[PDB]
Each structure stands twice: as structure tokens, then as C-alpha cells.
Design an enzyme around this catalytic site. Structure first.
Site, PDB file in Angstrom:
ATOM      1  N   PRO A  59      -6.576  -8.133   9.515  1.00 47.31           N
ATOM      2  CA  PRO A  59      -5.484  -7.668   8.658  1.00 47.31           C
ATOM      3  C   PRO A  59      -5.836  -7.750   7.189  1.00 47.31           C
ATOM      4  O   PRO A  59      -6.611  -8.623   6.803  1.00 47.31           O
ATOM      5  CB  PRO A  59      -4.347  -8.635   8.986  1.00 47.31           C
ATOM      6  CG  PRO A  59      -5.037  -9.866   9.422  1.00 47.31           C
ATOM      7  CD  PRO A  59      -6.195  -9.364  10.227  1.00 47.31           C
ATOM      8  N   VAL A  60      -5.272  -6.856   6.384  1.00 48.74           N
ATOM      9  CA  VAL A  60      -5.697  -6.731   4.993  1.00 48.74           C
ATOM     10  C   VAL A  60      -5.152  -7.892   4.166  1.00 48.74           C
ATOM     11  O   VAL A  60      -5.728  -8.266   3.144  1.00 48.74           O
ATOM     12  CB  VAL A  60      -5.267  -5.364   4.388  1.00 48.74           C
ATOM     13  CG1 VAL A  60      -5.854  -4.222   5.208  1.00 48.74           C
ATOM     14  CG2 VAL A  60      -3.751  -5.238   4.292  1.00 48.74           C
ATOM     15  N   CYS A  61      -4.068  -8.490   4.647  1.00 53.18           N
ATOM     16  CA  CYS A  61      -3.455  -9.613   3.957  1.00 53.18           C
ATOM     17  C   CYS A  61      -4.363 -10.844   3.904  1.00 53.18           C
ATOM     18  O   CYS A  61      -4.130 -11.737   3.102  1.00 53.18           O
ATOM     19  CB  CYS A  61      -2.116  -9.968   4.610  1.00 53.18           C
ATOM     20  SG  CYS A  61      -2.203 -10.677   6.288  1.00 53.18           S
ATOM     21  N   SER A  62      -5.378 -10.898   4.769  1.00 51.64           N
ATOM     22  CA  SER A  62      -6.374 -11.981   4.713  1.00 51.64           C
ATOM     23  C   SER A  62      -7.687 -11.547   4.025  1.00 51.64           C
ATOM     24  O   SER A  62      -8.534 -12.391   3.706  1.00 51.64           O
ATOM     25  CB  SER A  62      -6.676 -12.536   6.117  1.00 51.64           C
ATOM     26  OG  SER A  62      -7.375 -11.600   6.924  1.00 51.64           O
TER      27      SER A  62
ATOM     28  N   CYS B 171       0.996  -8.944   9.198  1.00 50.70           N
ATOM     29  CA  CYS B 171       0.047 -10.050   9.102  1.00 50.70           C
ATOM     30  C   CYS B 171       0.023 -10.908  10.364  1.00 50.70           C
ATOM     31  O   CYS B 171      -0.004 -12.137  10.289  1.00 50.70           O
ATOM     32  CB  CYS B 171       0.360 -10.924   7.888  1.00 50.70           C
ATOM     33  SG  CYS B 171      -1.041 -11.965   7.366  1.00 50.70           S
TER      34      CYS B 171
END
Lengths: 163, 168
Positions: B57-60, A25
Site C-alpha cells: 500500500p502507498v500509505c507505507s 491501508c
């Protein structure tokens, strides 16, 4: 913009964007190039865009190959610059298999640094160029004569202009 | 912007690199071709979803992976084309496709050059990016259109939500 030449001071308040080393992240943060480079010998090469194909100009791969020679000439930092955001730049660095910050992959936000010296193109990309900045002083500067012309900003050529 | 019932605009042109070949995420020598979505989609059922940028990013926002997970369901509801759209150029989009391990045309990775289409429908931001949105276009006719209320808010354009509207 202004142009840059040998003998010039590197402009002050030059700020790029990048994702710091490791690991996902990662968040883009500012890279205060003017401050960071004041006591370093740096190679900075800019190019039209991240992820341009393999068959086109081998700009980055040549810098990776010549990295041992570049370190031997006392260069502390090698950086590649483009207009892509720091996410794309960082993914491009991975795609080029660059690890441990050997070459920094930096974003020039909206090509504002490149625009400020007159080395951006008509579509908002950086042009292809190289700068050697030794402790805040420019000692080599070259703008390529066209977008996919690779010569004066190449690792080989930049190497001939390092003591 | 766009709403159900409206016709999908004419002369909408995207840029992309057709999928093929060996490496990731580097196109050997792929070259951007125009994708004439208005003409290509005139006789098809299509999901088009846009987002602020490739390699975010996939986390966002787990936006693309959720469409990938739901693709068998999506096809079972008659959808011919699934496409992700962003302002990044075709080289970057193609690389992002490989990085998502999407092969063939399972999902198309399309560029909206200077967000011009998104701009034309008023769904672009001030930074020149597309906003995050989804469209279901069935033979030239919009049957579902939703813009997200924030940049990294994933709800009205998610695969799961779009699917609810397909299933109805």
C-alpha cells in the site's frame, strides 16, 4: 511432508495470512484456520500463484460461478490459497471482483502449510489441490497430477464430494 | 554492494511481461520473457528502483506513484529507461503495473526472480525479498547507488532524491 486424506483431522495450529474485509491501508494479519474452521464446513483450494493469466486454468472463476451450488451444499467458507503474500492475494481477489468475503484470499506464508503436508513444489509455491474440511475433519482431498492440470481440485469435482 | 564508478554487473537477467491489451489487472495470456538488463542498458541511461514487494500500500511507501508524477522531469534529464524491480513473479508485476495505471513502457515492471540479482549485490533481505534501493546507470556505469536504511524508509531511492542527483 505427510499427505492428507479423507478421515484425517485437519492439522492443528494452521495459520495463514490475509487482509480482513474492507476497505486503503489494509494490513496483513493472521488467519487461524485450525481454530476458525473447527465448527465449519470449508472448501480450501490451493494453486500455484495469484495473477496467473486469464487464458490459463479457470480455477477461481469456476469457484465464483459455482458459489450458489456450493452454499446449497451447506459449505460455510470457501477459500483460495497460494504462496503470494496477503497484499497480492487481496489485490487478486479484487481483480477477480470478489466482494464481501464470498471467497477468502489467503496466503500460505512461504508455503509452510503446503510444505508440511508435502503439497508444495520445488520452487516454494503451493501445488494445485483441494480440501473439504467439515468441522475439523477432512472429507475430500485431492492433489492435481501437474501444475496446470485442473480437474480433481475443480469446483465441479469438489461439488460431487459434498452431501 | 554497488557504488558510483562501479560497472553495472554482466549477465543480469530479469523477468517480465511486456505491456499491452485490455484488462486490469489480468494479463490475457501474457508470458514471462527474460529481460537482459546488462545488454539492454549498455547504451542507455536508466533509473532502476527496487522495493520489498508489489501491491504494498502507498500509505507505507508512495514509491511508484512519485516516480510516475516525476516522469516528465526524469525524461528531460535524459533518462531512457525507468524500471521498478521486485521479487514478485512477472505476472504479479504486470498486474501491479496496470493497477498503477502505467501504460506502455513508461515505467517497466520487472521481476528479480528469487531476488537473485539483489542477492548477488548483497541488497536482499532474509525473507527472500529485494530491499528498497535505487540505481542510476548511465551506459553500463553506475552514477548513483543508494540502499534505504529500513524496509519502509523512502528517502534515498525516492524519485525526488534520484532527480536531485540527475540535476547535478
Amino acid at each position: 511432508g505427510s499427505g492428507l486424506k479423507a478421515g484425517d483431522s485437519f492439522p492443528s495450529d494452521v495459520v495463514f495470512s490475509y487482509i480482513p474485509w474492507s476497505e486503503a491501508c489494509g494490513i496483513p494479519i493472521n488467519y487461524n484456520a485450525s481454530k476458525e474452521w473447527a465448527d465449519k464446513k470449508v472448501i480450501l483450494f490451493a494453486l500455484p500463484g495469484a495473477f496467473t493469466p486469464v487464458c490459463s486454468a479457470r480455477h477461481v472463476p469456476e469457484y465464483i460461478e459455482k458459489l450458489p451450488e456450493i452454499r446449497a451444499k451447506g459449505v460455510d467458507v470457501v477459500a483460495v490459497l497460494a504462496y503470494n503474500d496477503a497484499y497480492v492475494m487481496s489485490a487478486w481477489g479484487k481483480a477477480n471482483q470478489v466482494t464481501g468475503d464470498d471467497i477468502l484470499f489467503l496466503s500460505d506464508p512461504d508455503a509452510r502449510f503446503s510444505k508440511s503436508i508435502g503439497w508444495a513444489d520445488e520452487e516454494g509455491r503451493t501445488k494445485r489441490y483441494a480440501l473439504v474440511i467439515d468441522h475439523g475433519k477432512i472429507t475430500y482431498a485431492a492433489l492435481e497430477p501437474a501444475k496446470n492440470h485442473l480437474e480433481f481440485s475443480s469446483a465441479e469435482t469438489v461439488l460431487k464430494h459434498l452431501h
